[PDB]
Amino acid sequence: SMSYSWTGALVTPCAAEEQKLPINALSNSLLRHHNLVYSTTSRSACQRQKKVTFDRLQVLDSHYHDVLKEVKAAASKVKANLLSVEEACSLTPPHSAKSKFGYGAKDVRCHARKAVAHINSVWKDLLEDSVTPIDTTIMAKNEVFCVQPEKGGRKPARLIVFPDLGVRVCEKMALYDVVSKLPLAVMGSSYGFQYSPGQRVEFLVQAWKSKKTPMGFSYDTRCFDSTVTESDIRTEEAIYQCCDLDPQARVAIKSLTERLYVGGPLTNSRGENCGYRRCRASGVLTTSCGNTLTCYIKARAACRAAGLQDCTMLVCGDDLVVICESAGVQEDAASLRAFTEAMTRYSAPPGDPPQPEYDLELITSCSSNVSVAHDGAGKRVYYLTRDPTTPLARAAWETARHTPVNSWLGNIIMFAPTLWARMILMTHFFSVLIARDQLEQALNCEIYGACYSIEPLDLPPIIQRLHGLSAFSLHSYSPGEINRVAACLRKLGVPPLRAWRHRARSVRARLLSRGGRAAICGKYLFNWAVRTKLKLTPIAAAGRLDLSGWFTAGYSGGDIYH
Numbered sequence: 001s002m003s004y005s006w007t008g009a010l011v012t013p014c015a016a017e018e019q020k021l022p023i024n025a026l027s028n029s030l031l032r033h034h035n036l037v038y039s040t041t042s043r044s045a046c047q048r049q050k051k052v053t054f055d056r057l058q059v060l061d062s063h064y065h066d067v068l069k070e071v072k073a074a075a076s077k078v079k080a081n082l083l084s085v086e087e088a089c090s091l092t093p094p095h096s097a098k099s100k101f102g103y104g105a106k107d108v109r110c111h112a113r114k115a116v117a118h119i120n121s122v123w124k125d126l127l128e129d130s131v132t133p134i135d136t137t138i139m140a141k142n143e144v145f146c147v148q149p150e151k152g153g154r155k156p157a158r159l160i161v162f163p164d165l166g167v168r169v170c171e172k173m174a175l176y177d178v179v180s181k182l183p184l185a186v187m188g189s190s191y192g193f194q195y196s197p198g199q200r201v202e203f204l205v206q207a208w209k210s211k212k213t214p215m216g217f218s219y220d221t222r223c224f225d226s227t228v229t230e231s232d233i234r235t236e237e238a239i240y241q242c243c244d245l246d247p248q249a250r251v252a253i254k255s256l257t258e259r260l261y262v263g264g265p266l267t268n269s270r271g272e273n274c275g276y277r278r279c280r281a282s283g284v285l286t287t288s289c290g291n292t293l294t295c296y297i298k299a300r301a302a303c304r305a306a307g308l309q310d311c312t313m314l315v316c317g318d319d320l321v322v323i324c325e326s327a328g329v330q331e332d333a334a335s336l337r338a339f340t341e342a343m344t345r346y347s348a349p350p351g352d353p354p355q356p357e358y359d360l361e362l363i364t365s366c367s368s369n370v371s372v373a374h375d376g377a378g379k380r381v382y383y384l385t386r387d388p389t390t391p392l393a394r395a396a397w398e399t400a401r402h403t404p405v406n407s408w409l410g411n412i413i414m415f416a417p418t419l420w421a422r423m424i425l426m427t428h429f430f431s432v433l434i435a436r437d438q439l440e441q442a443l444n445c446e447i448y449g450a451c452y453s454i455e456p457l458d459l460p461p462i463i464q465r466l467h468g469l470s471a472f473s474l475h476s477y478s479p480g481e482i483n484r485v486a487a488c489l490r491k492l493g494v495p496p497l498r499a500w501r502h503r504a505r506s507v508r509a510r511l512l513s514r515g516g517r518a519a520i521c522g523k524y525l526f527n528w529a530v531r532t533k534l535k536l537t538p539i540a541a542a543g544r545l546d547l548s549g550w551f552t553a554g555y556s557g558g559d560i561y562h
Helices: 026-029 042-051 063-073 083-090 104-108 111-126 165-190 196-211 229-241 247-261 288-305 329-345 389-400 407-414 418-437 454-465 478-492 497-514 516-527 541-546
Strands: 004-006 038-039 134-138 144-146 159-162 212-219 264-267 273-277 309-316 319-325 367-376 380-386 442-447 449-456
Touching: 004 144, 004 319, 026 144, 026 389, 026 418, 026 454, 038 380, 038 389, 038 541, 042 134, 042 159, 063 229, 063 288, 083 104, 083 111, 083 165, 104 165, 104 442, 111 165, 144 389, 159 497, 165 229, 165 309, 196 212, 196 309, 196 367, 196 380, 196 454, 212 329, 229 273, 229 288, 247 389, 247 541, 288 319, 288 497, 288 516, 309 497, 329 389, 367 516, 389 407, 389 418, 407 418, 407 478, 418 516, 454 541, 497 516
Parallel strands: 134 264
Antiparallel strands: 004 273, 038 144, 134 159, 212 319, 264 273, 309 319, 367 380, 442 449
């Protein structure tokens, strides 16, 4: 059972693709080593195709089946509703790929007659045809990274596989409620997407502290999407059907599973047949939910096979962290090898073998880690951070070129308490917005895969709500974090933190002079940059912000607008 078969046709672009960071005075002011920053393009698609193509052998055992039974029992407590066409239309992002059948994202969002008529015809066809594979488009993702020569140079492009816009709207009708409720119901505190960054830190810190002698590890499955088998995807369907569902939804979910999720033909942007998929599609509504459920089932079963004592797991799609009670150094190393053997039998072998970790700050969940800073009183504060390299490279790219969705705003929100988000990202982007007369304009960004429209001037109350007032006053960061940031600035050619402090003082002054929300940005976001501190008190506006649903479920690849 090969994850893919190929015809030899190329994955083609639908537009020109810039490969290197363009030179632009504003982006250059953030980072000057532009030759290190690149975007993946269709040019490397063949390299990715080779990597993700392999035979999957799967041997399921009693632990696997015990866990699946638990999961189906928990799922039976869930009730999920159908969305109306109108409700589903409104979940469509303004930048969503146009339909091959004569309408676009804008038409769907306005509930245009041509779009709605087609969507209805697709739904009708899901009800009437349970078997014929649905076409998908394969594209090479353009994502920005910094080169790491000591690791292999450049990453090849990820491949995205997605059905037509009409099908995507139907997926929401049938499954939006399911994928929004089911993972939480099934795995409880282990479902990572239910947590804000602060809540994730609280979860990890308590898991660590509760152990006599904690040991943790991350498990990196190699090409997780390709390891997901046809039986895995059919098992996901059986799990969805455990919910209380509307009769039409039950038929549509089965049709979507057999005709789309389980596999199907891959077409390039030129309309040529590229091959056939028999694994997870990365661009469907169920990608995040399915990966999370399947990773959880396999991992929980593998924890049992591995004899891991008192296992606490946090799962976000294909991303897995486990914290447990240590049985000794040799014992732990052996247990982790047995965990890997079990995951492998379940079809999911690792890229690099996992390693036992005994220091909390080294535990990595979704490319992030817990670190320690201090508040005003010498009190230790735990917060979530990450290596700033990819955030900084992407920020530079997004300064030089307009992109429909901006990673920098999401990063500022997620990583507000960090040394680097505060001193570099906030300073840079307020300076850019001021320079371009764009301070008052809402921007699209992504949180857990879902797209949101956010006004930068609302950052202070948003940050207060999510991270608390201390996020504006943390100091005395860890030696490890300070060193990691410093190495990153040297690598990328980013000005030193003391330079950013000077720039921040100027930006702060300009913001204060504007009054209103801008003055609140100057006051709260940049208090770190002045020697004469202002007293930061709860922002009146913070209480009224909704923030409902921001950190509730994962939708990466799901084409979701909130």
